[PDB]
Design a protein around this nucleic acid. Sequence first.
RNA 1: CGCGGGGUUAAGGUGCCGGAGUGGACGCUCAUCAGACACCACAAAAGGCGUUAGUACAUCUUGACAGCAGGACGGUGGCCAUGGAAGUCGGAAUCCGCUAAGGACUGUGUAACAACUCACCUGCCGAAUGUACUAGCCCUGAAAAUGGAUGGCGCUCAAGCGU
RNA 2: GGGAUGGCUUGUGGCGGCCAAGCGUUCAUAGCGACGUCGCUUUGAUCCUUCGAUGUCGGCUCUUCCUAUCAUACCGAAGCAGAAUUCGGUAAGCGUUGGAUUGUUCACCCACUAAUAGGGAACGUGAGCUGGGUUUAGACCGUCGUGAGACAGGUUAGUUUUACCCUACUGAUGAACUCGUCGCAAUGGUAAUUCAGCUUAGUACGAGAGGAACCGCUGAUUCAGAUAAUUGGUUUUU
Lengths: 67, 79, 254, 237, 97, 190, 135, 169
Amino acid sequence: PKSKRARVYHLTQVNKKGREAKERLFSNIRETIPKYQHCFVFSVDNMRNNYLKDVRHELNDCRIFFG
Amino acid sequence: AGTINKPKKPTSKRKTTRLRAKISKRAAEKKRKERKLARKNPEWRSKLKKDPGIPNLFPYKERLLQQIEEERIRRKEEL
Amino acid sequence: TGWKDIPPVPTAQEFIDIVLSRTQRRLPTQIRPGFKISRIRAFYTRKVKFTQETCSEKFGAIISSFPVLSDQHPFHRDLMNILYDADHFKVALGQISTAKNLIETISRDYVRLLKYAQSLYQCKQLKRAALGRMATLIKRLKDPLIYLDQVRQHLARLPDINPTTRTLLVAGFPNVGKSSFVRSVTRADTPVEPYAFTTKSLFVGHLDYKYLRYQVIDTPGILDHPLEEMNTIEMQSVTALAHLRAAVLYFMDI
Amino acid sequence: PQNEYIERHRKLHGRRLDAEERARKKAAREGHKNSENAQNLRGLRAKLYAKQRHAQKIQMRKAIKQHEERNVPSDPIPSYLLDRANPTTAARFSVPIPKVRGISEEEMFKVVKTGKKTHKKGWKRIVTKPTFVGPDFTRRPVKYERFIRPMGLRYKKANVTHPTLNVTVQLPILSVKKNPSNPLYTQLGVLTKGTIIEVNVSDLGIVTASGKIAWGRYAQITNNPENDGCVNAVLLV
Amino acid sequence: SHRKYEAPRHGSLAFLPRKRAARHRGRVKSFPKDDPKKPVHLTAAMGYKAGMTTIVRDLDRPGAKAHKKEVVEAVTIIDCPPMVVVGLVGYIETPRG
Amino acid sequence: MRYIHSEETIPVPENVKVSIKSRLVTVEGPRGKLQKDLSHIAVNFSVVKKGVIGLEIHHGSRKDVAALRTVRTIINNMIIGVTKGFKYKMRYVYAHFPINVNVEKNAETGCYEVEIRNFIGEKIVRKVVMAPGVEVEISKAQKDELILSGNSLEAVSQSAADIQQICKVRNKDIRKFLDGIYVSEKGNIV
Amino acid sequence: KRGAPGGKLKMTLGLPVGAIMNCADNSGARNLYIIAVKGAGARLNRLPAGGVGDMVMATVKKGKPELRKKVHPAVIVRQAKPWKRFDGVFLYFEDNAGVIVNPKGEMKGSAITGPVGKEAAELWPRIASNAGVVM
Amino acid sequence: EVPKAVIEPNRKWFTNTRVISQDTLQSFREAMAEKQKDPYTVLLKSNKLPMSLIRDGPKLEDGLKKHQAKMTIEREPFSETFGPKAQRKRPKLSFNTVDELAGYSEQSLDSYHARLEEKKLLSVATAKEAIFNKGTSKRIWNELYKVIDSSDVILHVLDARDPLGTRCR
RNA sequence: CGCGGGGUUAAGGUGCCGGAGUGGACGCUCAUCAGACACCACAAAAGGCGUUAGUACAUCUUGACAGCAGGACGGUGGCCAUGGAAGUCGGAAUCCGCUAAGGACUGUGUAACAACUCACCUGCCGAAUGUACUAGCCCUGAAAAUGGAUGGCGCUCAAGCGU
RNA sequence: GGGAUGGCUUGUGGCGGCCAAGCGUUCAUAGCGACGUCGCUUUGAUCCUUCGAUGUCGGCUCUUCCUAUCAUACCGAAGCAGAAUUCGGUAAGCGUUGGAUUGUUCACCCACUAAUAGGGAACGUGAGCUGGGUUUAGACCGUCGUGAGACAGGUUAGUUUUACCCUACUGAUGAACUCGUCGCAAUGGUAAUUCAGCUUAGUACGAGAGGAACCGCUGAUUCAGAUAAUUGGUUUUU
Ligand SMILES: [Mg+2]
């Protein structure tokens, strides 16, 4: 296929994460499991979710994963 | 361009004997000159060329690698 | 009158492309080795002379179109120094004239050599040598051409201030209503805003009083520090106050 | 209008209502347009387009490689010479050009015809290559001038490069020492490729071991002055 | 080599050949295009050239310099006795005309 | 490579009737009838399912396989035209000279006609004839707005483009002279 | 704007390049030598020529020395070659004469001696204002 | 016949052909300083000398003037002075106080009026006739330079009625 | 290479001119003067969002590639400079927190802010993709001047190209 | 007696150093190397530095072709406000002038103009007319030569003189088909061009100075085809 969309190489600082981010998320969750008495599941459906920053600040003794 | 409505003078594909002979002579001279330059070439050349190897899409490449291992082990045992 | 009739100043690469495309297209290109040597000499001599003539026309147009600072009224001379550094202005035009003279010298030398060249190959080499040396000289002018094109655009948009007519010069601190007064008495579109240095260049409007035409000059504001600490914006107003014989309206906000 | 009036007009009235859409669509059509130019332009215009596209592709590759490598003087000089533009600075007594193309007398000299009859006398010869005539030169009378060295082909200076110091200076020519094709060419002072000339090296500031100033040295001509319109030489050091 | 000073060619090649006309009576090469919605009418007539004379015209040409003024103009008189109709020719359309 | 079989599908709504004969497609809806000849494209039409049209190409190259996507969208646009319709809103703006737009319906031809006057003070009257089936109305909700509506998207958008191109400023700086008639909204009637 | 006036009907041109005509004004010049005609077209070997009402470029051969060193625009007001007006009248004057003007048509001198033609008077309002007789 | 054009290896190619001592240079500089011109003496044979090491240097005013432009560009490049990336904020002035500015404006206006009056004291005109270009032809000046190249003595002939008028400087 | 009859071939050919195949097999190619007796030059490591066949590296149901809906933050208006300058006129540094992720910022924008946008992340979706090279064929890779040439017609799953 | 370089060329210098993606090489780490870069080759100046004919071009008339486009037409871009332009694209349909200057490479000046574009068909030898390179015999001066004479040269005067042939071209007749009248239309040719004025409008636009365009109207330039009422010219109306 000679006719193709030219891919834009980005001259920006931040690169794609890859499998390293997945393994880091795995290790962070599995290392936070033994330190806490309860693990809640919460849902935020069709919401902007920028207020989770304030929720994380308020619950400073808790650990929130949103991955 | 307005080629379809107003075409220009055609570029002839009919060769002349003079140009054919001159092109043949220049090609022969270029072959001789290239042979001479290859004979006086100072660029380094490898004794053995680099092998491409086995293509990855060949479905029994791993089996061929196993056979290569077995052959070299048998050769080492025999020697 | 103004300075809108200055022709556009190309970059060095655009200049080279323009000159060489004129030479390529406005002259015949096909010459044969089997022709007479005088015919070959005439062909390449004409190529070199035409290239030099195009360069001379464009450089001379640049030199003759831009203002001569020494020929201006002292207001326009000082204002031009404020807007563009006068040393840089004269230096850029000096480089243009020097390149024009050197291109003519190169053309004369290679025409003289083409008088004695003995073959098409030698004539072609001398022609290419002359054109390449001209292109090198033009390529050395990269920064002055960019600077002069920017100066040309700003000069084209400068307001026309007659320095010997009836003029009202509105001066003062920033934010005291200078542009508001000028908008209220003239038709000039000088913006009015609450922040300091809304007006960054001289603006001129006009009015009629007793069947006579007056010009009114809105200025950037002036701060209370000596002349050595003033930037170019405030120094435009200082130049207008120093060199224009006018009626000065100093605006104050009590 | 005065000052930045088109910018003020944009501030007060905006642009045309389809301006952003048309610009976006044209930028989107640029890929097809560039391919159409690559396949349909002709002649010199096509050649210049292809060369300039080659230059863009090389520059883009360099920028991409530098951005990949974002996450990763030579000779000792004193402090007063730091941050200046300094040159890079990179028995058998053989010259750099030991052999050049030989020039026959037929190529060197052309016949100047004299006389008013249809058959012309042909004893005069004109030198077709650049020459050096030396100081205090007065031409022979025309009745006794066999060899014509025209004034437009006479040279006095040369662009001499020093191989060790890596500098090129324009220097006066002192004399022509040896034209490799013919001693007659040497005597006439012909400046062709491979010719050994004597040059004035006062500007180069060369001091001998005894403290004397060396102002005359030998250079070899490395170009063809009859084709270039200049004399280029390399100092023999 | 090229002609040094340009000049247009003498005469029009549209009126070639400059031979004698094949007939004394002029030939109507083309009649006006027929519109069937118009009423029936004749498209041509014959006459005999008698000579020329001079007239004075009271000109009504708005925008012209000679507007509302008298102009002297040359005219041609054609003697036109009535024609007599004696025949009718029918024409069909074929792929050869 | 030649692909043995390639297929696309078009869903048909309940109020639509589609008739295809020798690649001549006729689409019937509440809003009327549209027709389109697709015999320049090699395609086999079928009824795969109740309310689904199947399009297929046999032994085709990549280009022939790709052409079915165009055929699919073209027929889907005819279906959308006979169901919901197409509507293009245009806005005309000016600086000093008010643009006068008058809309008539030619009784002889059945087409709408748009006359544009006083475009930057010009004295000529610009006349654009709409494609048959395109209706033009001057809006009452908004100032200086025309509304072109119809069943055929191509006819509506080409009529809008003809109006856009007839009012072109020539030999003036277009950073400064902003007058014109521009397409401002595209959508469905329903 | 160039010197050629608009709205001028075709007339017989009587004065080609090289003609010397009288100066009908009091600017100091006695005669005018035509070197060019405004509005003349391009034709091989054809001398440019003007008639009454045309602007030409002229040099002064006889007159004040201050006028000798310049090329002045001039308007032909009288010609001796017969020409026809639109009323069928063929007419001519007894000499060829013109007046020096500027490119805007305003006269250098302040009075005109003799009559001027209707064509020149109608095309140039300053000449019409300075004419005593119009024929 | 094409010859063999070859340069033999030789130690003479890599030596100094002409050397001069510092004492000799100083003596020649003293000769430079004490040289006087006599119309009744002619030059018969020039001495081959390194004259760039002997002659007096340029005057300091011309030496600084000849580098002022490149100095100003090296100090302040064109793109930093005017343009979209320009950083110039402080102008260069010929005055430092408001009183000096008032005096400067007065003197500038006087000089401007003086130059206008000088220019004023100093229909298009007809072209200069081609007869007044005689004596400036390329053919004539080619003949002149040919004669100069061929002659040892040059007799410049002057009309006694107008000697400086006929003198060719 | 004597004068003849019959038979068979070489080089070259078998759409018509033209004797002999619109012969067979698998592919490739669409040229705004293709190509058909090319090799040389133009001409390069040349330019192609033409079209196929490959090689290598890489991503991917732990959801790739394209999109759409949203996030894109806090120390912080980081330092210097500037009339003003807050990621976005400049000079130089370019770290930390919260992180799922988010540059001391990729562009638009403001006098400066604001606002928008990109990098990067999440949800929806759903199965294959991306990049760089290599080999074919095709286009461009420079042309003058009376009207003309694959020998001519003409030929496009060829009557072109490879076997 | 013998004769009378060419699928060349075009727009971007040479020499020297450095860098360099890549090519090679990886028992040697050399060698090649695009894109680039750096060195040599007046603050808008000076006008007191014109640097060698062995090589020859012209002019008139007239036709055609190329496009490498000066103008006219359309179009893309630019602080392109308007006006005037500049850079570029398609385009050869249509134009592309009149003079001065020979103490000279006759090339540059002046003006008109919409514009005063560049070439080929000769100059890769070459019977149209007529000037210069140019040169038989007469003559003078300069340089050389003892001289006859020759030339670094300069000046003056000076014999080639078809066409009725074939073809081509332009026109004109014509056999065969009874004579004639009215027609058709294959094919070949083909034609128009540019400017100005009035209106729009002192309007859009503009701080001001200034200042358009479409529709509408009237002339003129160059070209082309006719004509003779009138005005000039011509007179063997002898
Ligand atoms: Mg304010």
